[PDB]
Amino acid sequence: FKNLREFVFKNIDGYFKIYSKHTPINLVRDLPQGFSALEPLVDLPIGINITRFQTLLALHAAYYVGYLQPRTFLL
């Protein structure tokens, strides 16, 4: 694959906060190892409860899903 697209989606007090980073890659088998912080891009004042989500693909690319935790980091 050529393009790595990473996003963070969290919903706090009615705001759907989106962070993202796009980087060039040269790897098919799996996600590349490395570190980069994601910058805030969008903050949507929607007031909508989110419990479930679904992705949308174009039918004529692998994707990964993890979950966030209230952990402490030293940056």
Binding site: D13, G14, P45, G47, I48, N49
Partner: protein, 33 residues
């Protein structure tokens, strides 16, 4: 929210919305539609 930052402004509509007027319904920043 308990840490709300801002101002709440309100006024009487007895001579504006009242008629009766049944178009007003009741059930942090959530729109429970």
């Amino acid at each position: 929210p308990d840490d709300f930052t801002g101002c709440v402004i309100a006024w009487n509509s007895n001579n504006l919305d009242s008629k009766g007027n049944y178009n007003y319904l009741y059930r942090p920043f959530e729109r429970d539609i």
